[PDB]
Amino acid sequence: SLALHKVIMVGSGGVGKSALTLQFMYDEFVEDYEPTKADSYRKKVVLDGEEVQIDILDTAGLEDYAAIRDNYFRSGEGFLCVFSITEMESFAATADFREQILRVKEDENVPFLLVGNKSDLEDKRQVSVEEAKNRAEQWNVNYVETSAKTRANVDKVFFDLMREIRARKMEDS
Amino acid sequence: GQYLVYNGDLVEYEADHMAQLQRVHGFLMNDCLLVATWLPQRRGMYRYNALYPLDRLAVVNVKDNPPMKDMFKLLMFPESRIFQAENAKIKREWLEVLEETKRALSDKR
């Protein structure tokens, strides 16, 4: 039976969680903002020779109830922690998102990638590449800048996350 | 005060492999969702009833994809349950009332 890798999009409102998901799923991108509640997507892909399925849970950057947020996080196996390079506060918000994730999952090596989205808006950069890399290195995770608009590194973040999820499964069994 | 906001039949599916399970009935009240299931058994027609408080219940819109149509998902530790509505209209209504009653719960606290 085809493996199933469960990905959870995490990050402040507006960073591009939905845009990254939709670019990856359907090769589409729209400029208009569309506040998300909670949407689940599934797609068949070939991962290193194997036909597998990726499941992506895309939710709002802000959830009123902590218990609900925990239920979202708990259903996942790997996380794309997204922040926008044009907004330093979204970058600051990643620390807590990570804390909340480590707690709910109770696992320090939880598959996780720090993602700096909106790389096409370089002229508006508020977060430097070094800052982000340094934060990622201290968290012992990789950092990748993406652009849901031009597709830059979009497949890369989802596939890299799938490989980390697959790695944990290979040992934890 | 308390009242019946919405109710209806749904068909449950196992979330990971999308295998069809059984019919269930959902009853939405102002602060929780009740899901009544009836699992026939040799000589013990089993029944599983679950109550999901709206301040802890994650409701997810499962996007249409062939093995899937008109479904939504409920996530509340330790469960993940998928339900199929009879059509798109019914699904829309479930998602609308679930969201509105949760919203009302908030502006109530």
Ligand SMILES: Nc1nc2c(ncn2[C@@H]2O[C@H](COP(=O)(O)OP(=O)(O)NP(=O)(O)O)[C@@H](O)[C@H]2O)c(=O)[nH]1
């Ligand atoms: N130029 C540019 N715009 C982007 C990029 N990613 C997203 N956007 C834009 O930024 C806005 C917010 O994106 P969206 O994907 O909805 O963000 P989100 O993180 O899902 N928001 P929420 O948490 O509220 O659901 C949209 O107007 C979208 O077009 C990107 O890489 N480049």
Ligand SMILES: [Mg+2]
């Ligand atoms: Mg969104």
